[PDB]
Design a binder for these strands. Structure first.
Lengths: 193, 191, 193, 191
DNA sequence: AACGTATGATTAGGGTGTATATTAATTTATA
DNA sequence: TAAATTAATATACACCCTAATCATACGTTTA
DNA sequence: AACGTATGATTAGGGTGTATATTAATTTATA
DNA sequence: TAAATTAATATACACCCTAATCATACGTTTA
């Protein structure tokens, strides 16, 4: 049993035409939406063997995700899905594959879209990083002990290290006195000049 | 003639694999994107009878509306479109009648999604017919040439200069005591 | 009528002795504190002509400020105040004029004390400033436009001024362009080197 | 012999006025404080029979207990004490019986006030018989020699050094990323 | 018009104290 | 553990110092 | 013992995006 | 005034980059 479903788009307020359209494709019974509850009602009405007709994909849901649900539904209840606006929906519909086909493809595409958004986050991040990484921004860790250094205290330490170098102290002593690695002290040394 | 087209996603930098996968589907000749000009080149290369292969919808355009253009292009030049991840496309392929259909469908689905994502984040284009055709509403730019306080003006410029100089956002912000979000704003706006 | 008032100090818990002591000076009726409400009671009891006896100043209040109140009270109701611990206290109040006296002096002193704490604030402050002012710390206003300068933006401005100087632009133009005084620009000039 | 003693209060820097104000009461010889050593000097100068003049109680000591000492001293050496802002004292100094009395009284009043102000703010002296005669309670000094983290030790010292060098508190704080109160703590503790 | 140079006011960057509610680190009582 | 106890920190309130700047003005020299 | 010099791990100072509740500044509707 | 509307700011959440440092070890040279 052929079933239609219409719902006036706020940009396309005409109804009647839409209706006629539907019948023009066989719509025997037609639900009309005044949350879209009617829709659900219609979907519950149809069953294996019937054909559900609508003018355009978007009439199957307020957002893509929902469309998926809708289509899925029909797919399981094994109801033919027919969409008016599609050129040649007519000659093709008679193809043994087209149904299963159209249904799946729609789902796919759509899903391939959601998991594009669920990553819009990182994507733009990774996108930005890369751009930067190209500009030569990421430069590892900056000196932890040296003037300018973030933490003012380390600045103090840095200086004392130096002072202790001019004072001619011994590396080992410097290290222990400032709780630093020898290597590090050396770095401060061959760095000072 | 089977033709592939690859372009490394910033999140998926591997290339080689992508390549092989293309060949795995028949790609004889393969164009690689290093604006996406290569793409346009590949599209011009193909012609009635060939098959254009790609890994995923998005490789056909930076934004959906471009994809539409792409797909539409192929549809008219009558080139088979094949997407590595919507494998079933394989079937219908080879029956000139159904091929159109797919494209046609692919289009509608996308064209639709182009709203559900376009009617959500509403806009630096309304500042060319409201501020360039009258007087703009809301607070005025604090940092930009013209700006009331001359010093801000100076700052604005330095921000820019530092952008061309390719400096990092964070550094700019701190150097000018501004928010990143603001520097951003100065960025998008410059153009 | 001679009236005494006792209240055991937590450091001096003996009572009885204190009592005797009071009587030893004439206490006919004696109030004993077990907020110090009894005290207020006793104070209300006395009247012009009576003598209020206590062992020590502090028995007149929980803090100096209160003692003042107490004493002031007695002074107005014209009640003789006597304090035991004072050497020659009798020899003293055996004169009628040494009453007015003691009362006033106490008040004075005490007041001259509160008005010492009332300023303990500014005192230590002014005290500290001075020390510093001596150490040569206070150094006026530091440069507003120059590298290092507090506000990063002005730092930016400073530089641009310079740049515009090397670029050989004119003072006046610099000034207007950076919303600064000529004098100031000159300062930046006659400074750079 | 009438003797005065002046010392400019940091809140009342005028000197000269204070001086005359002393002479206005008879001050023949006047000692001026530039620890208060002059004061002690003046006190040693006076002899039974003389009168010691000062503007206000507080000029007799840095803290109350010292005043007591001062007053007591004068009381024994039998020197008249006369305080400028408690003018009514003049009415009586003549007679030595009322003189003692006043002092005696002045003492009690003060001795008293010495509690109402001593039993309120409850101490860097209990760290010489608890931490220098056992083990100290509470958190350990974070900045001080001995301190666990060696770097902290280094900082501590620099704070000190900067104190002797006579630097300003605020600067010290910022330079060592410490709180002012903390720097204070290091100050009072040093000695 | 810019430049060069003054002069009295206002000022922003720096200072001096004090005090309280929190969050550390330790030793020392319970349960 | 759960106290008890003392160090730091984070914040506020209150108000002090003083050379840079600002606002101004006024001859003189460059455009 | 220090010095001189390596080598693999961990890391702290720097980065990249995004998003929300507030507090600015303006123009533009009311009442 | 009271909206309405757009700029900045102040903060958080999420997670990426990478040369200094740390921890280590191991011959060699100074005390």
């Amino acid at each position: 049993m052929i079933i239609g479903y219409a719902r006036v788009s706020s940009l396309d307020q005409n109804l009647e035409r839409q209706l006629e359209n539907l019948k023009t494709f066989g719509a025997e019974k037609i639900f009309t939406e005044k949350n879209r509850p009617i829709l659900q009602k219609a979907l519950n009405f149809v069953r294996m063997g019937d054909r559900f007709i609508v003018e355009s994909i978007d009439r199957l849901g307020r957002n893509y995700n929902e469309v998926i649900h809708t289509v899925n539904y029909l797919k399981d209840k094994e109801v033919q899905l027919m969409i008016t606006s599609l050129p040649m929906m007519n000659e093709v519909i008679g193809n043994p594959l087209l149904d299963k086909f159209m249904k799946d493809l729609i789902i796919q595409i759509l899903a391939m879209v959601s998991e594009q958004e669920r990553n819009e986050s990182k994507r733009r991040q990774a996108q930005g990083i890369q751009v930067a990484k190209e500009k030569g921004v990421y430069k590892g860790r900056p000196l932890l002990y040296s003037p300018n250094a973030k933490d003012p205290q380390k600045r103090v330490i840095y200086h004392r290290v130096v002072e202790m170098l001019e004072e001619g102290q011994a590396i080992s002593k410097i290290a222990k006195e400032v709780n630093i690695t020898r290597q590090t002290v050396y770095r401060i040394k061959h760095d000072n000049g």
